Design an enzyme around this catalytic site. Structure first.
Site, PDB file in Angstrom:
ATOM      1  CG  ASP A 186      -1.967   1.031   1.230  1.00  7.61           C
ATOM      2  OD1 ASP A 186      -1.797   2.153   0.709  1.00  7.61           O
ATOM      3  OD2 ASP A 186      -3.089   0.763   1.682  1.00  7.61           O
ATOM      4  CE  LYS A 211      -8.002   8.228   2.172  1.00 11.19           C
ATOM      5  NZ  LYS A 211      -7.213   7.476   3.230  1.00 11.19           N
TER       6      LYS A 211
HETATM    7  C1  LIG Z   1      -7.905   5.678   3.146  1.00  8.61           C
HETATM    8  C2  LIG Z   1      -6.889   4.580   3.060  1.00  8.61           C
HETATM    9  C3  LIG Z   1      -7.310   3.346   2.571  1.00  8.61           C
HETATM   10  C4  LIG Z   1      -8.724   3.121   2.145  1.00  8.61           C
HETATM   11  O1  LIG Z   1      -9.057   3.708   0.852  1.00  8.61           O
HETATM   12  P1  LIG Z   1     -10.523   4.245   0.490  1.00  8.61           P
HETATM   13  O2  LIG Z   1     -10.283   4.914  -0.806  1.00  8.61           O
HETATM   14  O3  LIG Z   1     -10.836   5.125   1.646  1.00  8.61           O
HETATM   15  O4  LIG Z   1     -11.464   3.103   0.468  1.00  8.61           O
HETATM   16  C5  LIG Z   1      -6.390   2.344   2.448  1.00  8.61           C
HETATM   17  N1  LIG Z   1      -5.063   2.545   2.847  1.00  8.61           N
HETATM   18  C6  LIG Z   1      -4.632   3.754   3.312  1.00  8.61           C
HETATM   19  C7  LIG Z   1      -3.189   3.869   3.692  1.00  8.61           C
HETATM   20  C8  LIG Z   1      -5.562   4.795   3.432  1.00  8.61           C
HETATM   21  O5  LIG Z   1      -5.215   5.891   3.882  1.00  8.61           O
END
Ligand SMILES: *Cc1c(COP(=O)(O)O)cnc(C)c1O
Ligand SMILES: *Cc1c(COP(=O)(O)O)cnc(C)c1O
Ligand SMILES: *Cc1c(COP(=O)(O)O)cnc(C)c1O
Ligand SMILES: *Cc1c(COP(=O)(O)O)cnc(C)c1O
Lengths: 398, 398, 398, 398
Positions: A186, A211
């Site tokens: 991620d 984000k």
């Molecule tokens: C927000 C977030 C997610 C989830 O993504 P969404 O687009 O909110 O479903 C996953 N990993 C991280 C590091 C995040 O900040």
């Protein structure tokens, strides 16, 4: 050396990659394919589209040309072969994991995880007979020791949700290569502008494009980038059949719009957060600070090796615990109190009193969460305004 | 003689339900809430938002006011307590079933499903330790004879994809109530304007809003409607954690826009489809024909009990087999050759030379798919032009 | 010097000014009022909104909240009392001048002008009884000498669109105090980030928001900022009755999105242009370069004095003439051949062989257009790629 | 009957005209060219483009492919050579009149006009030397006597925004042909589905597409249809230079979406309208009623000659004057209190207490506005709910 096969730089590709206006009536901005179906000239061209034999489309859930340009562009930015665009971060994470794991498979997880990821694993896929183990991914000995041959996937965030804990991506990759496991990272927090996990051995990168990549807080989106072989599978099984998490071409177009300033925005996110982090370290109300760009960071050396800039996120612990965290949060007038990160507007959160309020203090310690822990998504506003807001709220924290 | 703010009629509610302009500055069309995150006045307010009290939004993946309006409105139309909006039809079904089922539970299914429902079931959730079994959901005795104490869910479409096969929804529900099973009906083809499975005893209804509810072929979306109990679970587990199939507020607003003409378009779809099916029935080239509004239709009595009108879809089988399929399809100048349905423009497909083109005649036999089967989504065009185009394409099919 | 009476920094206001998420359900990003019309609770609260006695909308052609936020925000950035958003740059310009001039009035104009502004004046409003006089606005003695009692408006761009010619805005405003004329400046090229004519004494500023303010080339828009009384007049006469140039709320939202990175984009435009312009000055084929950032720029000290940075636009002159211009333009692989400016993608235009190729070499000369005049709108790409593209293309110029 | 030059019916063309999905990768729905500028493969291609040779695009204010689709479709629907899309109805009116009028020319006007059109004429273009005379466009003697050599334009609405006064459109065209004058008709109320003024001899047609064409209250748009040579001039002078009233490609796509159900909505608007009119016409609180579809309607015969259906608009007068109308509007619970019309939601207005509230009783009677005149835009809701609401508000009107 100027070269004939030298990649254009990041900024150029974020703006241009995969698109020639000449192929589209000269339109400088790609037209938006807000359409669910496509049509066939005959049924021979139609049958060849369902076979992956011709590169024409049939249906927007499976593939869409606005979506394809986004995916192509993001793959370039990460350095990977192929991209998938989906309706959210979780849609990226679920489609990928659902594709790759089956009952009896084991997944090794970073010790701390984004809450909904932790939820997906323990209350979702992990209840359908997939085994879970947490390890400290910065502990290469203990990861080596945790590997079985049932180990199908290693999944982590770096830096990770709560205290910004890094993992050594290439050292993790080495151990996965040995035992034959797939490494999924991620990369939400850094984006491909600051960290490129595929260049360090990971097989798949996932993103909450909600984000930083979008940058402006106005869409929900996810991205997967990896090899064609893996992404093709996540497309045709994880997405098509198992989540249905299709991204809107409207939102994909906004996403690309955001990506065009990504470098610029991140430079500012990082420059502002550095200043703010250094401010916070010297304040009497602050027990402890986690910021990759401070020398005091435990994994400082690892941060400068695998990330080109220390990022826009800060976690710190207030001396006076939960009450202090609450009062600090309630005082902010420029910073907003909200979950999320990576917008133009600065955000703050205090899990003890918000996301995780209906646990006990002891259960919060279980999940890496201090009573006084506050997380800041440092935005693009003027730093003097942000310092004034943080200083005033620190006072109110007592 | 019931009056004084009685229950408003279907058209009225499709336009107005759940929205008074005076609560948004007089805005006649509700503003679109194209924001990922929401803000709290205090942290304590925010503790309450995740805990279920003082409910009013944290993050659009869980919930969003534009989506909430759509959801409430579709709930009103179907006569259920609660709605949920998702990124696709598949999003609705996967989020639903992922939530309701666990390894060891069994689910019973109509004989034939939508291709990807079928693929999710057999190649997705089925491979996670969930037992699958196909019964004929018009045969109440055979259904009873398949029930086990592990049967948790009964899922089917009505009419169902290939041959327009009806289920006695009232009948299935009675059995399911005795056994403690949940009934989920895919109501895409009828929409709540023509059929409301919840009033006939179903627990949950699901839709590809991509089709008739949008009506204009520019969004992918899904809906779930049913009880607060069931929908709260699907929202908070299936969607939040297992699919991440978040609908774009933009597309949710186009969907609400489409719903505003739903009665009008469904009346026309049904009037056009009637004329064409009567025509097709008198045609030497056409072997059999599957339209619920023909007196000859096998389940004519059941369909008029459950459906207020006979629908917009026609299936017919052609005498020349596959060869006559290919000639007919390639001869259409007005109907478009594409998958999908419930669009203003008329669509035509013929799985033998398109969707299931490389399946060879036998595996096709084991799914209901005749070698000469042609499906029509009859659209909103002038009935004479559509007649002419079918006329001309039967001639060329010889 | 702490204290709440301090003006927030430009970047803070570009992101936040005029909006508190708390007033709109916590939405971090303001919801889009994609509505034509607004409603009243009584006929009396209706009578107030048509008279201006109450804060409230009735019709988006006159006023709409999404537009009103865009307007308040632009006003803050230019340092004016009020703003107005319109469907294009020409919508702002025509709505302004149609409002301020009547037959018999004189408008003093800058010596060169944007092609369409020029056309509006001489072939449009000028043919309706309004007298036109061109004057060098950098020559204050000449401007003083041109004033007459019929002079109502002085109108110009700075820098001016073709050759970057500049006018002393404070100098012009002071002559205008003396005689009584209304000063309107087209500030498109600078944006409020770089130059604020209202602060130097102009009465009104107009923009093609299509260019830098949007930044991303996806919308067509215009803005007027000025005194409450003049902008109100322009709203209620020029826009409402005389142009109908209403901005789509959707587009207004995109423009607010673009404004959130305005300072960041302008910094990069300007840095890239400084580097490109220094390079262009050092090169054999360049007869004459015009960039405000180079000392060889004829109004160097004036540019340094009214603009915080020299801008993203360059005009140069190739030595080979019209022919070498066509040759250079056709050789561009990264710069795109197109009109417009202030995009993320760098643009190049050559009037002699494109916009003004209908003309004769001596009619081009009447308007200040050299035969080798190339104009560059330097974008946000990596400077090394753009250097290479322009190096490559200068070779191809012989 | 069948001839090779066959014309598809209204509904077919409204959905399909001018678009083959095969020219855009199969996209059922046309892609939205949300782009400000367009690119050239060579300098010469762009040169022959500004010139008008070669059918390519350069800048979206001048012309845009999405807009041109809307324009060709509207041209077809009205039976005219060419179309133009603008930012609002006022955009279309002003862009039209500023092209065709110059100082000393006379425009002859229907007796009553939409307030903003009247404002443009009297307090805008009329203050630039253009002479204005109002005349009754049903009285052909009076019109012939009103003509002069200055008379260059005859502009009116029909039915007209008062009392639904009709004009003899074919009569007017015969007189205009005698003097070379250009007849422009505002056909907002009818839409092409119900009246086609060009088929009766008018040169140009204008539309507030904001109303019925859009149908859903979410955009502001204008349409002009007429001869290629007029439209070209209105585009290249009115639009380009004199108003800058540029339609967003996004709003253009929504308007195309709306036009796809135009027949269907107009059928229901008129059926609801006929019902409320027959009800209203028998109520004791109601003095007069103006609805084309009542037999008592003064211009019944002419109405039925020009219009295939009597429309969705009704005007009536309440016996109790200003107070009655106030009490009625305030009692309404389904009908919204708003200006505008052609929305799916039913709207109502009472000019004496709203738009024209500031005026005096003598000044209102001067423009044909009774103290008790209420205007209804009949919507697409269940006629029984609408009846109950009108009913109840009639009882409170005492
Ligand atoms: C927000 C977030 C997610 C989830 O993504 P969404 O687009 O909110 O479903 C996953 N990993 C991280 C590091 C995040 O900040
Ligand atoms: C299309 C369809 C689905 C799938 O929905 P998507 O919106 O395409 O994901 C499910 N059921 C039926 C009957 C369908 O037609
Ligand atoms: C482009 C431009 C305009 C015109 O604005 P549009 O958005 O194209 O209508 C006006 N002034 C300047 C300086 C421009 O560059
Ligand atoms: C509303 C209206 C107009 C003006 O159109 P806008 O889209 O509001 O600018 C013109 N004519 C008629 C008859 C109208 O109703």
């Amino acid at each position: 050396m100027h070269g004939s096969n030298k990649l254009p730089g990041f900024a150029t590709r974020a703006i241009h990659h995969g698109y020639d206006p000449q192929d589209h009536g000269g339109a400088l901005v790609p037209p938006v394919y807000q359409t669910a179906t496509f049509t066939f000239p005959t049924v021979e061209y139609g049958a060849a589209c369902f076979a992956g034999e011709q590169a024409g489309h049939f249906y927007s859930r499976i593939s869409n040309p606005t979506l394809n340009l986004l995916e192509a562009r993001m793959a370039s930015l990460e350095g990977g072969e192929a991209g998938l665009a989906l309706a959210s971060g979780m849609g990226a994470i679920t489609s990928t994991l659902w594709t790759l794991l089956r009952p009896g498979d084991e997944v090794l997880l970073g010790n701390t995880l984004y809450g909904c990821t932790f939820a997906f694993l323990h209350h979702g896929i992990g209840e359908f007979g997939v085994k879970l183990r947490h390890v400290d991914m910065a502990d290469l000995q203990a990861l080596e020791a945790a590997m079985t041959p049932a180990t199908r996937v290693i999944y982590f965030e770096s830096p990770a949700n709560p205290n910004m804990h890094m993992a050594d991506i290439a050292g993790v990759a080495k151990i996965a290569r040995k035992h034959g496991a797939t490494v999924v990272v991620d990369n939400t927090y850094c984006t491909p502008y600051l960290q490129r996990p595929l260049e360090l051995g990971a097989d798949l990168v996932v993103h909450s494009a909600t984000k930083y990549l979008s940058g402006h807080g106005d869409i929900t989106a996810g991205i997967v980038v990896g090899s064609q072989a893996l992404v093709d599978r996540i497309r045709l099984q994880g997405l098509k059949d198992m989540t249905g998490a299709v991204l809107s071409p409207h939102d994909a177009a906004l996403l690309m719009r955001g990506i065009k300033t990504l470098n610029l925005r991140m430079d500012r996110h990082c420059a502002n957060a550095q200043v703010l982090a250094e401010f916070l370290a010297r304040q009497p109300q602050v027990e402890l600070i986690h910021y990759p760009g401070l020398a005091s960071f435990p994994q400082y050396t690892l941060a400068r090796q695998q990330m080109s800039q220390p990022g826009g996120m800060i976690a710190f612990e207030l001396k006076g615990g939960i009450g202090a965290g609450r009062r600090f949060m309630n005082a902010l007038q420029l910073f907003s109190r909200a979950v999320s990160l990576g917008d133009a507007e600065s955000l703050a959160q205090h899990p003890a009193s918000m996301t995780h309020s209906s646990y006990t203090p002891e259960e919060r310690a279980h999940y890496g969460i201090s009573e006084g822990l506050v997380r800041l998504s440092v935005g693009l506003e003027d730093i003097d305004d942000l310092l004034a807001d943080v200083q005033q709220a620190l006072k109110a924290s007592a």
